[PDB]
Design a protein around this ligand. Structure first.
Ligand code: VI
Ligand code: ZN
Ligand code: ZN
Length: 266
């Protein structure tokens, strides 16, 4: 006689959980997460912004890296998200408790964050994390400005209903750098065709490929750095092989078409 299985925690490659020192992207923008999960700090004369936090166990490391940059808990004003999965939104509830930060997100991301990633359209209750509340709801194309850095929301539904690309302009050498933080365009283990929980999944991904291709995009970063060919452990050469937004969208679409064909075959 056989009991119900124990709960299984989601495990990840060690590199996803490997702390790294701050890596500078542009004049006010730094990578502060791990070797394989993006967490972007944008530092301004009127406070700081964090774009994603990575996994639940990353909160204290993020705070250490902020302190190393001169950003205190009180100085962190805003958290934005690519999407509200456990591997990017994991420590948001904890960061809100330990800092001044408020969360801005679209309605879809807010609803999923408030459930802590439970009842996911594809993963069910498999990838839960501590729930958090959004403080501000944003619409597509809406701008948020901190210390004169202007963040623009570009909805790119598919990976999650609330998937968002965030764009802003920083500087390097007195010249503008148009940075695009584009969300994931994967469909890990998804049923794509005839999905009752997401009937227009395929059209949404198609529109999202087009949205990504057209972003203002001098430098592309992604929540999993490998997707845009970043190597954060490579120091001075981390971003050398980085894809354009055009090439990232094309590769994602080619992968997606292959997955659709494998699904029809299966
Ligand atoms: O965001 C996702 O849906 C996701 C995850 C994931 C891992 C742990 C918890 C939640 C999601 N892992 N992966 C992943 C990424 C790169 C290589 C292999 C797998 C993804 C993804 O978007 O593909
Ligand atoms: Zn995800
Ligand atoms: Zn992910």
């Amino acid at each position: 006689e056989v009991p119900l299985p124990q709960l299984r925690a989601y495990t990840v490659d060690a590199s996803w959980l490997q702390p790294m020192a701050p890596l500078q992207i542009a004049d006010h923008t730094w990578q502060i997460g791990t070797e394989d999960l993006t967490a972007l700090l944008v530092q301004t004369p009127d406070g700081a912004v964090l774009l994603d936090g990575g996994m639940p166990q990353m909160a204290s490391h993020l705070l250490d890296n902020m302190k190393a940059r001169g950003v205190t808990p009180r100085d962190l004003r805003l958290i934005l998200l690519s999407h509200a999965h456990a591997d990017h939104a994991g420590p948001v509830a904890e960061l809100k408790r330990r800092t001044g930060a408020k969360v801005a997100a679209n309605a879809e991301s807010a609803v999923l964050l408030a459930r802590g990633g439970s009842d996911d359209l594809h993963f069910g209750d498999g990838i839960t994390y501590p729930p958090a509340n959004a403080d501000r709801i944003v619409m597509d194309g809406e701008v948020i400005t901190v210390g004169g850095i202007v963040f623009t929301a570009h909805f790119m539904a598919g990976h999650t209903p609330g998937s968002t690309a965030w764009t802003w302009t920083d500087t390097r050498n007195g010249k503008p750098v148009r940075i695009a933080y584009a969300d994931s365009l994967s469909a890990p283990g998804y049923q794509l065709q005839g999905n009752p929980r997401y009937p227009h999944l395929i059209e949404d991904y198609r529109r999202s490929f087009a949205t990504v291709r057209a972003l203002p995009c001098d430098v592309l970063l992604t929540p999993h750095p490998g997707a845009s060919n970043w190597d954060y452990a490579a120091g001075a050469r981390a971003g050398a092989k980085a894809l354009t937004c055009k090439a990232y969208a094309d590769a994602a679409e080619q992968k997606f078409d292959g997955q659709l064909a494998k699904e029809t075959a299966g």
